[PDB]
Every structure is written in C-alpha cells, then in structure tokens.
Symmetry: C2
Subunit: 159 residues, 2 copies
C-alpha cells in the first residue's frame, strides 16, 4: 500500500511559503518540496512524480512539475530536486510543465483563491517512458495511465 | 448570442475521418475542420480557437489544437487552417498542443473508446494575448479565462 510522506508538506494543510512561486505577485521561495515514498508494488520499474492544480481555471488545470523515469530504487526526492539543487540521476528527466519550461514552479493562484496542489508519485511497470523534455504533462499522463501499478499523493492548499 | 457552425462537423455527430489523426493506429486525413462564427459580442478584440478532448485519460484531458490572436474581424477558419493549407494572417499564432508541437492533430483515442472532441471559439476583450508558440493549452486557457466575452462550441464524437 504505497505511501507518500514529506518533511515539508502535510496532507490537507496549507502549502508552506518555501514552495510558493517567487513571481506573478507572490514572493515564495519557489523550491520543490521534499517527497519520500515506501511500500512500492512488486513489478515497479520506474516512478513518475508530478505536481498538479486541478482548480486552475484554464479548462485543463495546471501542471506545475513533472519528473519521469526515476529508477526503480528511488524512494525520495530531496527538497529542491526540481529547483536545481540536486544532481539528476542518470536517465531521469524533468519534462515540460504548463509554465512552458521544465522543473518545478510553485503555486500562484488568482489573488484570494484557494486551490489544491496535488503532489503524486506513480509506480510504473516500465523502466522508461518514451518521452523527451518537451513532452507535456498530458503526454506523460497518457503514459502513466497505461503503465501505473499504484500511486500515492499529498495535497497542499494554497492560498 | 455567438454561434459556431461548420461545413464539416455537426454538433453531437461522429467526427468525420477527414479530421481523425493519421497515425497511432489510425489512418484519418488529419486535416483541421472548417469552422465559422457569427454574432460576436461588442468589445471583441481577438479570438482564440481550440480543440480539446476532456475524456483523454491523462489527468488533464488533451489539447489537440490551439489558435490565438485571430483578429477581431475573423469569422472563419477554412478547412486545413491548422494543417498547413492556409496562410497565417499577420499576428496569428498556433500555440503548443499536448502532442508537443503546434498545429492541429486529430482524434486517436484508445481502440474502441468514444471521446468528446470539443471545438470552441472564444471572443476576447484584448487584441493580443502575451504568449509565444511554446505556450501550453493551459497557459492560453488561463488568458482566455480572464479575457473571454463569450464562447461557442461544436462537439464531435470519436470513435
């Protein structure tokens, strides 16, 4: 029964300022949160980690961060993994977000709105998904849908 | 009361093969459908046209086609406008789809599934949205949400 925990986030609590966006009217530190998981399914060959806001009023939500092809032995993403603080393990790729770039960028909702910022880890049954860094969050999501063995998430609320 | 019509599509009917994707197991012609609109709101300064599948199992649906900054006098997109058959009017941009490129690419659902393929035209209150060709459908959608005066759509069902 795969579990996702974090030294930074608490499921259902407010997203700490450390992980809020640093512009667009906000002044958060824009650092990806620590994430750690356990009890993965047998047959796991890689992981995908994402940050998605289902409440962004765009017609398709908003992908904040997408990490693919994490090797089967991965059980943690240190704080700042999506922010240039951590070396990328071989074969890992950070793919394209709705901000038109790769890597993590935090919450920055319309002033006064509170959205869900869902951090999810998916265990896949394939070692590598066939994508490059220009792949959209939906394109990764398509691959996740057909290859997922299990998932676990933590949702942080912002504002 | 803005209306959207088409020489090719009929709201609620099957998407013709001419507009289905040409690969991924399908052999449609992959040509964008004709779209035409009328009775636009006063204050309209530009239009955005999109094709979205809310039923794609990706976590965020799928953006098939996004066209922005169509001038205020636009009332039609000839067949193939998103397929290289039509010259781009000055200032018009086709932005990034979930297929990781610009331009129209048609329906190609999981074998045997029937999804909605929604074609929408939005009348905006601003002449240009500040995006380049790398902007995601959500990024365009964010701009549409804050600038839309009205919208009209036609939904085609595929398979």
């Amino acid at each position: 029964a795969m579990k996702l925990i974090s030294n930074d986030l608490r499921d259902g609590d407010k997203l700490p300022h450390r992980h809020v966006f640093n512009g667009m009217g906000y002044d958060g530190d824009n650092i990806s949160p620590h994430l750690a998981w356990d009890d993965v399914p047998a047959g796991t060959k890689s992981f995908v980690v994402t940050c998605y806001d289902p409440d962004a009023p765009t017609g398709s939500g908003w992908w904040h961060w997408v990490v693919v092809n994490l090797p089967a032995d991965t059980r943690v993403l240190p704080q700042g993994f999506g922010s240039g603080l951590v070396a990328m393990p071989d074969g890992v790729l950070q793919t394209r977000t709705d901000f038109g770039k790769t890597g993590y960028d935090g919450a920055a909702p319309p002033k006064g709105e509170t959205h869900r910022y869902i951090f999810t880890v998916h265990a896949l049954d394939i070692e590598r998904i066939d994508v490059d860094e220009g792949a959209s969050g939906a394109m990764v999501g398509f691959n996740v849908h057909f290859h997922s063995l299990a998932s676990a998430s933590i949702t942080a609320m912002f504002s």
